[PDB]
Structure to design on (136 residues):
């Protein structure tokens, strides 16, 4: 999933756009990949109860 | 770029680029190419 | 604002202006500092 960015591949973005314009799509992917993992840990702690 | 006759807005010419090798370092020292104000790609990332 | 050190340079180029042809000896849009330009 891209979460509204250009592509879901990281090496496309790091070798496609600018050294300081790719850091708003990478920061968009990171704030969804750290949210999906947080939701997974939260649901695992719910199931562990 | 060194072509004499160009086109207008209502009759904008088409020109596709086929199987080739892109050398964009030569394209900057020529007299036409000055500006690259755009998004989607980068001028330094066209060589990769 | 108070800063530690401030430095100034001197160079004349055609305006080339998209950088500051010049990995060719580079300042990005996130580098701290400013720039001065006149004719």
């Amino acid at each position: 999933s891209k979460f509204g960015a250009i592509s879901s591949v990281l090496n496309d973005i790091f070798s496609r756009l600018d050294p300081p314009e790719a850091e708003v799509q990478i920061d968009r992917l990171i704030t969804g990949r750290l949210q999906s993992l947080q939701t997974y840990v939260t649901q695992q702690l719910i199931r562990a109860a | 770029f060194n072509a004499t006759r160009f086109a207008s807005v209502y009759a904008w010419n088409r020109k596709r680029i086929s199987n080739c090798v892109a050398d964009y370092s030569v394209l900057y020292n020529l007299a036409p190419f000055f500006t690259f104000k755009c998004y989607g790609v980068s001028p330094t990332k066209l060589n990769d | 604002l108070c800063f530690t050190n401030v430095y100034a340079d001197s160079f004349v180029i055609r305006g080339e202006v998209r950088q500051i042809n010049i990995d060719y000896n580079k300042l990005p849009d996130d580098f701290t500092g400013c720039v001065i330009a006149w004719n």
Notes: Chain B touches chain C through five residues (CB under 8 Å).
